[PDB]
Design a protein around this nucleic acid. Structure first.
Ligand SMILES: O=c1ccn([C@H]2C[C@H](O)[C@@H](COP(=O)(O)NP(=O)(O)OP(=O)(O)O)O2)c(=O)[nH]1
Ligand SMILES: [Cl-]
Ligand SMILES: [Cl-]
Ligand SMILES: [Cl-]
Ligand SMILES: [Cl-]
Ligand SMILES: [Cl-]
Ligand SMILES: [Mg+2]
Ligand SMILES: [Mg+2]
Ligand code: NA
Ligand code: NA
Length: 326
DNA sequence: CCGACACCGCATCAGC
DNA sequence: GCTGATGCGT
DNA sequence: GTCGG
């Protein structure tokens, strides 16, 4: 965090472009800049210096000079004042409420936590759960707590079918000391890119987890992706643990390595990796790595038996999960 | 310039 | 109902 | 907002 101040500014700017300006690309642009600067091993002294890095152009260089001289950014000063912007930015913090709905709600006079609570009838299922755990969801998960959660999940999944394989990915697999949520990659020999010899594969596990009261709510649920809420149990007289977001993803067992690579992240790392893949003539998703034909159409999935094989194809030296935190 | 920017599952909608 | 666009978080 | 051709 040598440049904590700058990356914060950039991040704040990215949020404004996404939530207020609904400018997907300016948002991603700022995120890339905050990222590349976060890994820069020197306390940046000027915009010039920063512009040397990819993703940091002329505009951001100007802003960094302003930030270093004054210790702040006028553009953000104003944005903070603007009520509409402050409102939209706040509402988007509720899971399920994105830039559009945020702007719409403000248009209705619904712009505070108070306003949302007395207007639940105006929220879809996801938004209502997001408002319900507004506090909890903004809290971080200590890794120790992640270890307890991992234990419960792997053991409850084992009890359903000894052939299930559950791996905790995301920041946890990257070794983070705290996580925003718990992500679980699941596989069962019955479900492959070839056939789904068994139904309810994900259901059964969600069910078992709800039975032991681990999972408490469901934001969304399909045959392969489950987005929900969970909570570790507490001891006698002990205050209850905060509710945590949980994501489970069922992937074909034969496509495990593309899945684990994807679910391990980070998001920006995957973005930079999928970009390089494209510049190399390939395309990568959570299922496979395919080559790209002249026309641009993806071809047949190339053989993969390790995460490293994927890195090889794109001519990238292997990077351990801990080193993919961009 | 200026086109491209990673990729996709589930919820919800309009239009038929 | 089916299908495709769009929101949202992934 | 930034980049490569
Ligand atoms: O835009 C996205 C979001 C997530 N992902 C992948 C990578 C990420 O590590 C993984 C898990 O998603 P989370 O949103 O849980 N991210 P992560 O676990 O890295 O961070 P956090 O600790 O905030 O949950 O999904 C993407 O590829 N693109
Ligand atoms: Cl944009
Ligand atoms: Cl500022
Ligand atoms: Cl694979
Ligand atoms: Cl695929
Ligand atoms: Cl996902
Ligand atoms: Mg996560
Ligand atoms: Mg997650
Ligand atoms: Na640059
Ligand atoms: Na939100």
């Amino acid at each position: 965090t040598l440049n904590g101040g700058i990356t914060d500014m950039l991040t704040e700017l990215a949020n404004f472009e996404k939530n207020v300006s609904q400018a997907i690309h300016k948002y991603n642009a700022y995120r890339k800049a905050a990222s590349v600067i976060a890994k820069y091993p020197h306390k940046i002294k000027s915009g010039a210096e920063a512009k040397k890095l990819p993703g940091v152009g002329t505009k951001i260089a100007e802003k960094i000079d302003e930030f270093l001289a004054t210790g702040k950014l006028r553009k953000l000063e104003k944005i903070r004042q603007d009520d509409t912007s402050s409102s939209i930015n706040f509402l988007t913090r509720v899971s399920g409420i994105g830039p559009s709905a945020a702007r719409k709600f403000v248009d209705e006079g619904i712009k505070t936590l108070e306003d949302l609570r007395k207007n639940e009838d105006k929220l879809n299922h996801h938004q209502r759960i997001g408002l319900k755990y507004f506090g909890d969801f903004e809290k971080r998960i200590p890794r120790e707590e992640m270890l307890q959660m991992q234990d419960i999940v792997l053991n409850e999944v084992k009890k359903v079918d000894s052939e299930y394989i559950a791996t905790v990915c995301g920041s946890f697999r990257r070794g983070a000391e705290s996580s925003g949520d718990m992500d679980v990659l699941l596989t069962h020999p019955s479900f492959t890119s070839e056939s789904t010899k068994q139904p309810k594969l994900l259901h059964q596990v969600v069910e078992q987890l709800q039975k032991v009261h681990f999972i408490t709510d469901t934001l969304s649920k399909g045959e392969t992706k489950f987005m929900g809420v969970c909570q570790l149990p507490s001891k006698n007289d002990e205050k209850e643990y905060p509710h945590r977001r949980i994501d489970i993803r069922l992937i074909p067992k034969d496509q495990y390595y593309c899945g684990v690579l994807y679910f391990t992240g980070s998001d920006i790392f995957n973005k930079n990796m999928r970009a390089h893949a494209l510049e190399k003539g390939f395309t990568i998703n959570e299922y496979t790595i395919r080559p790209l034909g002249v026309t641009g159409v993806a071809g047949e999935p190339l053989p993969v038996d390790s995460e490293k094989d994927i890195f090889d194809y794109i001519q990238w030296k292997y990077r351990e999960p801990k080193d993919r935190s961009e």
